[PDB]
Amino acid sequence: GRMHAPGKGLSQSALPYRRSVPTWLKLTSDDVKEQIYKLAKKGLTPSQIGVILRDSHGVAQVRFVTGNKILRILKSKGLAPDLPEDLYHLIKKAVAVRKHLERNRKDKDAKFRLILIESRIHRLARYYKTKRVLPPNWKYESSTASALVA
Amino acid sequence: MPLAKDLLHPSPEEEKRKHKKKRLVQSPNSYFMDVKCPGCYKITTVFSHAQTVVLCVGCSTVLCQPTGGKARLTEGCSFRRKQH
Amino acid sequence: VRMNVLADALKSINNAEKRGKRQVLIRPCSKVIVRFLTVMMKHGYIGEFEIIDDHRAGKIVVNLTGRLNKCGVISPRFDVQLKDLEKWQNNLLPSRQFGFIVLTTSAGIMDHEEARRKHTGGKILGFFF
Amino acid sequence: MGKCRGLRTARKLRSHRRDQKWHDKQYKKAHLGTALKANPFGGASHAKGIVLEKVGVEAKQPNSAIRKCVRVQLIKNGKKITAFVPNDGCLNFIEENDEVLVAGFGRKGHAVGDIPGVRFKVVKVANVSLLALYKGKKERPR
RNA sequence: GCUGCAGUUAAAAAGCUCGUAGUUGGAUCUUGUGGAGGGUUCCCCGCCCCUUGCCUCUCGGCGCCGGCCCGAAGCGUUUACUUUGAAAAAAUUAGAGUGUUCAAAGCAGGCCCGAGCCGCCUGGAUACCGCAGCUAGGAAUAAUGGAAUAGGACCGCGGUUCUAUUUUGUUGGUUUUCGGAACUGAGGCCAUGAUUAAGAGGGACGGCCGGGGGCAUUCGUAUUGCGCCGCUAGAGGUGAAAUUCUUGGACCGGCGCAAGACGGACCAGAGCGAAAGCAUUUGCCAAGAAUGUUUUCAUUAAUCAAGAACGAAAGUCGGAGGUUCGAAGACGAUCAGAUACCGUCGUAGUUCCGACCAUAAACGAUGCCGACUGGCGAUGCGGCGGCGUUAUUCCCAUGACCCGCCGGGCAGCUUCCGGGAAACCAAAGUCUUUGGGUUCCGGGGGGAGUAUGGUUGCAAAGCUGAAACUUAAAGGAAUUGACGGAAGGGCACCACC
């Protein structure tokens, strides 16, 4: 199951077989696009974007009112970020850990957990960088972690 | 198990009370709802597990509340599914 | 993980037949499992079977009888060259008279008895009897 | 079971077996050759020596007897081996400071029967067998 | 022990986790009809769109009546696999033929005629030859391939540049033309190009949960010491004693203060943590599991040489502290002896801060990941459903109790699931009907974790690790006896009172 904990668990989303509209709805493909573009200005990232549509607007999902994903729509403009938010959130966490570690050198538990989250960055990086989604010279270090999260 | 039981055609909710990814076809256990209370006279549509505060444009500015699952509504009826 | 799908499949229908059952549920439905069970149905060891459809990969349900004694998998997949054949079938079958080693060839998936008449070797998958 | 069954795992099989074969007792003696160096034989079936002097060797319990062996130095190594003498009165047909021919018991490394410390026996005194000396179809050539 | 072994207790899973190499890895991209070969549909030509994908042609044949048609020429993105050919010294081996007197062998030999035939007939096969390389057919299986910041299609045109040497009979000066090649713009034509989201993983989001960790802070009683007050003779301790303590007074009772240590009862086959481990208050700092979700990414995974973090107690080095307990040591008893068990005193240590040390019955003596296969009642956490009591503000905020359902977690009970030598175990099950993936490790008992060299450490030692020689038993589970300064009953003047 879990990749750095021993646990096992199910909580996965389950989609219906259907996939019409379904009937009840509005905002033709085009309407949904301009509704999205406004949100990305405000710093709402693709995961947040689909949530804020699904909770309060008439969409089931933005993959059955468009022929594309949420991210590809943003990418066609050129307004997509230069690294995926997934990678960003890993790096975002580990800097605060390193701050706490400098403030407290006797928190061996934090030091331990850092080894996991550190190694999990490098594995993820080796997906993107082989697929030509990152430069083949980019590496993860303390210095590059500081600058890239800011 | 009686060790001979059917699995082709299940009971409407005595063999569809199971976990949603242990059913023959995967179904959600969630639904939408068409609302329109008074605090905000508009036909709003909202998902059952809100996950975030749904805002109002009327006198009120809150409609929901995200808890650990479904979402606690408020003093405004407005209910439907519809169909799904 | 679920490295090999076919290998996890047969053990269910093997276990189920022993206890005394006649309906099962096997997932996640590979095309390879379909053509296997087609050959196994012709000879008469199982009955008609229903493929449920999902977008994920499907699920299959089978109707079976006590005629089956055991179907096993042989993994990893070795080659046969129609002189290696006699050595394989001796070890894996209760008798010369019946039992059916299955394999895949460029002429499709079939029993060993058919492959010998087409002069086709290939990769072995499992067996049954 | 409990081990790899890959299709490209020929290396991981043939290197494992080559290591775990050395834990066998038999194999480890044959191929190191420490057998040859330690033995008073060169691996030869027999060997030849010259008598040093008769001895009496006590038996291991329950049995009690005196077993009348010899002790011998070898021609080609100069090291010493303690060797049993067979049937009754055959001790007399071995005389001190002559040559003899030795041979293993028939257990190929280990001391046999109730006699300890002996791993060798004696077959010919001087081109004449213990049999023909014992039975009386030959006589001492001296 | 690849086919084909074993690791709970018999020899045996690294203390634990991370991690590169290595090995292994989800689903998904075409079916019917006449003729021919075989049944009663089904397995060489074609047909629906495809059918050995195409063209373009031009040179050397086949045609039919200048004109037209179809074989050979480039090939279908690349491999493994499989099938057919080629090419493989003899002897040996398998094996055909042959009456060696039969045989082991050997390669021979057999026929008709008085010689008068001047001769006749016949053999000296065939198979096999790991690989790798060479050749041709198949297209299932397993890898690999393409247009998503567009270029595929057509003589579509422009802009720009280079070049080919043929012909006007030939040879020279010039210029276009034709062919090849290279580069640029704007426009048509494509159904104009994205498989799903694994009861795989990662990531976001929401409300919670826990003696999880770090830092700060707060509190309780006891113990010991000190001061003061009161009464008077013994007090400690043991099986029985004694050392020891005591009229400058102990022990005991009362009151206040100080020091250090420590978190009772509550506290449980309960919870959290990778393991080692983790219980007074309150706050701060970062972290994590489970559950909920019609959110996001789209195979990003599994297990692991190298290498890396953490790792009880004791011990070592440098500082602080030192109540309590206490190796060492000094005494008192018990004992023939008593360097012990027991009593008194007591150093190191025990505590904290900073460096080392890497080991334990670090034990569930039981690798990790995945699938399938009985029943029943509970408990901790989240979510959902419900005839009701119950809290408050009088009334569906969310609290407590009751009933049921769905996840994942610590466990239990039950049996001809099945297994095991048995003890036992829903896993140690799905194993002679043996193959899901992968790491580590074992080979009779001693010698020996010794010898030796390497490496790490200040020290203590840790890791890595033989042989000579010796021996027929060592060891596991279970059963019957005997025995017990084991437990429960009963009995005797050869037992006691």
UniProtKB/Swiss-Prot annotation, chain A:
Pfam families cross-referenced by the UniProt entry: Ribosomal_S13_N (PF08069), Ribosomal_S15 (PF00312)
Location in chain, cross-link Glycyl lysine isopeptide (Lys-Gly) (interchain with G-Cter in SUMO2): 42
GO molecular-function annotation terms? small ribosomal subunit rRNA binding; structural constituent of ribosome
For this UniProt record, the keywords arranged alphabetically read as follows: Acetylation, Cytoplasm, Isopeptide bond, Nucleus, Phosphoprotein, Ribonucleoprotein, Ribosomal protein, Ubl conjugation
Q: Which domain of life is it from?
A: Eukaryota
Phosphoserine found at: 29
Which residues form the Glycyl lysine isopeptide (Lys-Gly) (interchain with G-Cter in ubiquitin) crosslink? 26
Which InterPro entries does the record match to this protein? Ribosomal_uS15, Ribosomal_uS15_arc_euk, Ribosomal_uS15_N, uS15_NS1_RNA-bd_sf
N6-acetyllysine occurs at 26
Give the sites modified to N6-succinyllysine. Answer: 26, 33
Q: Main localisation, per the record? A: cytoplasm
Q: Which residues carry this modification: Phosphotyrosine?
A: 37
- GO BP of this protein: translation
| Post-translational modification summary for this protein | Ubiquitinated at Lys-26 by RNF14 and RNF25 in response to ribosome collisions (ribosome stalling).
- What subcellular compartments does it reside in? Cytoplasm; Nucleus, Nucleolus
Looking up SMART domains in the UniProt record yields: Ribosomal_S13_N (SM01386), Ribosomal_S15 (SM01387)
A GO cellular component entry from the record: nucleolus
Q: What does this protein do?
A: Component of the small ribosomal subunit. The ribosome is a large ribonucleoprotein complex responsible for the synthesis of proteins in the cell. Part of the small subunit (SSU) processome, first precursor of the small eukaryotic ribosomal subunit. During the assembly of the SSU processome in the nucleolus, many ribosome biogenesis factors, an RNA chaperone and ribosomal proteins associate with the nascent pre-rRNA and work in concert to generate RNA folding, modifications, rearrangements and cleavage as well as targeted degradation of pre-ribosomal RNA by the RNA exosome.
Could you say which protein family the record assigns here?
Belongs to the universal ribosomal protein uS15 family.
Q: What is this protein called?
A: Small ribosomal subunit protein uS15
Q: What species is this protein from?
A: Oryctolagus cuniculus
From Swiss-Prot, chain B:
Query: Which key words tag this protein in UniProt?
Result: Cytoplasm, Metal-binding, Nucleus, Phosphoprotein, Ribonucleoprotein, Ribosomal protein, Zinc, Zinc-finger
Question: What are the Basic and acidic residues biased-composition ranges?
Answer: 1-16
Q: Where in the cell is it found?
A: Cytoplasm; Nucleus, Nucleolus
Pfam families recorded = Ribosomal_S27e
SUPFAM superfamilies assigned: Zn-binding ribosomal proteins
Supply one GO CC term from the record: cytosolic small ribosomal subunit
Per UniProt, Zn(2+) binds at 37, 40, 56, 59
Residues that the record marks as modified (Phosphoserine) are: 11
Record flagged with keyword Nucleus: yes
- Report TM segments: none
Enumerate the residue ranges of region (Disordered). 1-23
Its needed co-factors are: Zn(2+)
Q: For this protein, what does the record note about how its cofactor is bound?
A: Binds 1 zinc ion per subunit.
A GO MF annotation of the entry reads: structural constituent of ribosome
Q: Which InterPro entries match?
A: Ribosomal_eS27, Ribosomal_eS27_Zn-bd_dom_sf, Ribosomal_zn-bd
The cysteines joined by S-S bonds are none
**Gene Ontology terms describing biological process:** ribosomal small subunit biogenesis; rRNA processing; translation
Zinc-finger ranges (C4-type): 37-59
Q: How does it assemble?
A: Component of the small ribosomal subunit. Part of the small subunit (SSU) processome, composed of more than 70 proteins and the RNA chaperone small nucleolar RNA (snoRNA) U3.
Family designation: Belongs to the eukaryotic ribosomal protein eS27 family.
Q: What does this protein do?
A: Component of the small ribosomal subunit. The ribosome is a large ribonucleoprotein complex responsible for the synthesis of proteins in the cell. Required for proper rRNA processing and maturation of 18S rRNAs. Part of the small subunit (SSU) processome, first precursor of the small eukaryotic ribosomal subunit.
State the protein's name. Answer: Small ribosomal subunit protein eS27
What is the gene called?
RPS27
Swiss-Prot record, chain C:
The GO cellular component terms are:
cytosolic ribosome; nucleolus; ribonucleoprotein complex
Disulfide linkage: none
Q: State the protein's purpose.
A: Component of the small ribosomal subunit. Part of the small subunit (SSU) processome, first precursor of the small eukaryotic ribosomal subunit. During the assembly of the SSU processome in the nucleolus, many ribosome biogenesis factors, an RNA chaperone and ribosomal proteins associate with the nascent pre-rRNA and work in concert to generate RNA folding, modifications, rearrangements and cleavage as well as targeted degradation of pre-ribosomal RNA by the RNA exosome. Required for proper erythropoiesis.
The primary location reported for this protein is cytoplasm
Keyword set, alphabetical order: Cytoplasm, Nucleus, Ribonucleoprotein, Ribosomal protein
Q: What is this protein called?
A: Small ribosomal subunit protein uS8
State how it assembles.
Answer: Component of the 40S ribosomal subunit. Part of the small subunit (SSU) processome, composed of more than 70 proteins and the RNA chaperone small nucleolar RNA (snoRNA) U3.
- Alphabetized InterPro entries for the sequence: Ribosomal_uS8, Ribosomal_uS8_CS, Ribosomal_uS8_sf
Could you give a single Gene Ontology term from the biological process aspect?
A: translation
List modified residues, type N6-succinyllysine. 87
Subcellular locations according to the entry? Cytoplasm; Nucleus, Nucleolus
Highest taxon in the source lineage: Eukaryota
The record's comment on protein family reads: Belongs to the universal ribosomal protein uS8 family.
User: What GO molecular functions are on record for this protein?
Assistant: structural constituent of ribosome
Curated annotation (Swiss-Prot), chain D:
Chief localization class? Answer: cytoplasm
Residue positions, PTM N6-succinyllysine: 54
Q: Where is the composition biased (Basic residues)?
A: 1-20
Report the CDD domains cross-referenced here. Ribosomal_S23 (cd03367)
Modified-residue entries (N6-acetyllysine), positions: 135
Gene Ontology CC annotations of this record:
cytosolic ribosome; nucleolus; rough endoplasmic reticulum; small ribosomal subunit
Keyword terms, alphabetized: Acetylation, Cytoplasm, Endoplasmic reticulum, Hydroxylation, Isopeptide bond, Nucleus, Ribonucleoprotein, Ribosomal protein, Ubl conjugation
Which intervals of the chain are annotated as region Disordered?
1-26
According to its UniProt record, how is this protein modified after translation?
A: Hydroxylation at Pro-62 affects translation termination efficiency.
Q: Where in the cell is it found?
A: Cytoplasm, Cytosol; Cytoplasm; Rough endoplasmic reticulum; Nucleus, Nucleolus
GO MF annotations in UniProt? structural constituent of ribosome
Task: Give all 3-hydroxyproline modified positions.
Answer: 62
**InterPro entries, alphabetically?**
NA-bd_OB-fold (IPR012340), Ribosomal_uS12 (IPR006032), Ribosomal_uS12_euk/arc (IPR005680)
What GO biological process, any one, is recorded here? translation
Per the record, the covalent cross-link Glycyl lysine isopeptide (Lys-Gly) (interchain with G-Cter in SUMO2) lies at 37
Q: How does it assemble?
A: Component of the 40S small ribosomal subunit. Part of the small subunit (SSU) processome, composed of more than 70 proteins and the RNA chaperone small nucleolar RNA (snoRNA) U3.
Q: Which NCBIfam families match?
A: PRK04211.1, uS12_E_A
Q: Which family does it belong to?
A: Belongs to the universal ribosomal protein uS12 family.
What name goes with this protein? Small ribosomal subunit protein uS12
Q: Which organism is it from?
A: Oryctolagus cuniculus (Rabbit)
